[PDB]
């Protein structure tokens, strides 16, 4: 077949019920994640090939960058609650991996301030139980799927994208294959 289990994707022997349709995991410490966001725009290109009625989920993980890694998972919960993902994603990535100006929770907070989120609004969110339960969801989803590596994408709690089995000569060709694979799995 053109798409084969173990080739462009793998199947979870233990499927996850009630899972988000398209579920993506990343870390701001994760070097291929940076590429996925800044150079390849994976999330965006996947969305462009997905149908009507398909919701797209993206979660941060704790297992990279220790203490700061956890702060980043909470900050991402803040971003989701405030709906400001598209304003902080790039400066967080560049702050961690490019300029290395993010070293503390306060530096994460500075990125949100500079993007125009108000201090009071950020700190209230940060400390809210809505953000607590949002952190819990992120952890639980990663737990539900045995997640030990990022970047990772899961379709309907049953299929896991496998980019290792796609051609990387041409970046654009890689992205299309990736997105087309998500579409195929989506329809499966």
Contact between 137 and 129 under an 8 Å Cβ cutoff? The reply is no
φ/ψ region of 116 (left if φ > 0, alpha if ψ in -120 to 50, else beta) reads: left
Angle of the 119-127 helix axis to the 129-144 helix axis, nearest 10: 60
Kindly provide the resolution of this structure in angstroms, with one decimal: 2.0
Domain that holds residue 100: 1-188
Tell me, what CATH number does 137's domain have?
3.40.30.10
Q: List Cα–Cα distances, 108 to 44, 138, 158, in angstroms.
A: 24, 19, 34
For residue 33, give both structure tokens.
Answer: 């994640």
Which of 150, 145, 128 minimizes the C-alpha distance to 69? Answer: 150
For residue 145, give both structure tokens.
Answer: 């799927």
- Tell me how many domains the chain contains: 1
Alpha-carbon span 77 to 126, nearest angstrom: 8
Contact between 22 and 54 under an 8 Å Cβ cutoff? The reply is yes
């Amino acid at each position: 077949a053109q798409y084969e289990d173990g080739k462009q994707y793998t199947t979870l022997e233990k499927p996850v019920a009630g899972a988000p349709q398209v579920l993506e995991f990343f870390s701001f410490f994760c070097p291929h994640c940076y590429q996925f966001e800044e150079v390849l725009h994976i999330s965006d290109n996947v969305k462009k090939k997905l149908p009507e009625g398909v919701k797209m989920t993206k979660y941060h993980v704790n297992f990279m960058g220790g203490d700061l890694g956890k702060d980043l998972t909470q900050a991402w919960a803040v971003a989701m609650a405030l709906g400001v993902e598209d304003k902080v994603t790039v400066p967080l990535f560049e702050g961690v991996q490019k300029t290395q100006t993010i070293r503390s929770a306060s530096d994460i907070r500075d990125v949100f301030i500079n993007a125009g989120i108000k201090g009071e609004e950020y700190d209230a969110a940060w400390n809210s139980f809505v953000v607590k339960s949002l952190v819990a969801q992120q952890e639980k989803a990663a737990a539900d799927v045995q997640l030990r590596g990022v970047p990772a994408m899961f379709v309907n709690g049953k299929y896991q994208l496998n980019p290792q089995g796609m051609d990387t000569s041409n970046m654009d060709v890689f992205v299309q294959q990736y997105a087309d694979t998500v579409k195929y799995l989506s329809e499966k």
